[PDB]
Amino acid sequence: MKTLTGADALEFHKKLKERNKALHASDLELALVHADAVGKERFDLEELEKICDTSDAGRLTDAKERNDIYERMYYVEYPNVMTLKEFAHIVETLFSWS
């Protein structure tokens, strides 16, 4: 297809960012409704941390990227996971591989 260039490229990128930001927010909103309905354990970072390491080798020192990364993964990516203990095993698996 024809290459978008100059201002058309920039406007496509700006509109696409807005689309994907709506999708990002929506995925988590809808996942949280579903999780409430099925009685999924409420996400709690401190409890999860007692049973797996979420630091990425201490590369993640913040809790704002950190809570945001894991709570979103918990609800959006793993809707059938009902408990933090289950999720912990998933996080451990993620950090056993590049």
């Binding site: 978008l4 990128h13 390491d53 590369r59 059938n80 591989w97 590049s98």
Partner: protein, 332 residues
Amino acid sequence: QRKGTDEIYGLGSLPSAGPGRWEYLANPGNWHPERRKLHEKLLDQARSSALTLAESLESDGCQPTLFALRGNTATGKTRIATKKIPVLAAALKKTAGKGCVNPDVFKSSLAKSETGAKIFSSAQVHSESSFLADRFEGGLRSQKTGSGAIASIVVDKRLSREYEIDSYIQLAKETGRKVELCDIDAPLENSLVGVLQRKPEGEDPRPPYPVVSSGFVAVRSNRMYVIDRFIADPSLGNYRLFGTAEDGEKVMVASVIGGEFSVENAELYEKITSPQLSVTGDLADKVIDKELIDRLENNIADPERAAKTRAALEKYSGKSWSAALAAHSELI
């Protein structure tokens, strides 16, 4: 197989947890001496290969550069590096591909332990390979060539998240390196079949399903953030994004080169900046059956690729993708 080599070869009271453990073992002195010697030997080997790369790249007129190859597992990253970064291809030829910063480059060596055979699994060696890559990377940060110029280096990792991308940008800016970033995407199912084609006797990693799916999600969701870094700062270096067309061919999708931003394939760009998630969707439970094998084969025209795809898939026929990769990953 359970116990990690960090646990097996670490000396004494190992801090539990993550950080604590990470710092403790970050000290080469907390390892049994034979293990410390193996570490030294692998780092010297990696270092010699990285210097070979850097002297090649400088001789071919490349200013000090951090070549970052972003993208999920088994997306065709190596083939893009080879074909679409001709200066780096020329360098990697001299080292047979060695010298890049990537924990996986240490795993075969740590898993054999100079014994002659693989006796630890990839997962068993991962923490230790990660500590070595960090030490290797730390020694390259201000490494110079024979001209006194900062050495070019290659970071071959998924590089999915903003914190990682920011850290490497900072390293580049602090050491006067440009960032040359090629970002490579394939559909999640292509990565899954890519992983089942990787043979245990090879050195490419064979992770289980969650690694590949969560990698996919992270790489796609954070992609536009990485592009925005290049759009905002023309001096940072260059960015190119390659995606996969229906027939499996890689095509240019978007780029920021010499500050100029262009979208070479707007349809793919729309698609590969999103993880295409739904509230309960599960590819993990999809069963590998004849039609799935035929559906993948229908879009693969190359004979060698098609045959290898097919044989890898038939080996796990009847299993879900999650069961197939979990079984594949458990091989040594």
